[PDB]
Amino acid sequence: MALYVSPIVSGEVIRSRGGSTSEFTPGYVKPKHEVNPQMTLRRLPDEDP
Amino acid sequence: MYTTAQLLAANEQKFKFDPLFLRLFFRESYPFTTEKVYLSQIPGLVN
After folding, report:
1. For residues A42 and B34, is the Cβ–Cβ distance under 8 A?
2. For B23, left (φ over 0), alpha (ψ -120 to 50), or beta?
3. Which of B11, B35, B9, B17 is nearest to A43 (CA)?
4. Residue pair A33/A39 in contact by the 8 Å Cβ criterion
5. How far is residue B14 from each of residues B7, B9, B18, B41, measured CA to CA in Å?
6. Which of A11, A23, B16, B42 sits most deeply, having the most CB atoms within 10 A of its CB?
7. What is the 3-state secondary structure (H, E, C) of A1-49?
């Protein structure tokens, strides 16, 4: 804060401030999915008969 | 080495194959588009 150093002593020296780092590197996602080429033979729920 | 041999026509050796069925009875060919293959034969019999 400041507290009260008297005008007869030098006083203490404050450490200024600062210093904080961090890392958040990798991440990933990959939704592979199949087309199923033999699924197209039968009738889909759509595509009215 | 030093031969210089010229070659004429070569044989074929086709063993034996003559269908006679895909050329006398199965003259009609239609492709598919669906899973099922229907084949009807109406029983024609009139009085």
Report:
1. no
2. alpha
3. B35
4. no
5. 21, 15, 11, 40
6. A11
7. CCCCCCCCCCCCCCCCCCCCCCCCCCCCCCCCCCCCHHHHCCCCCCCCC
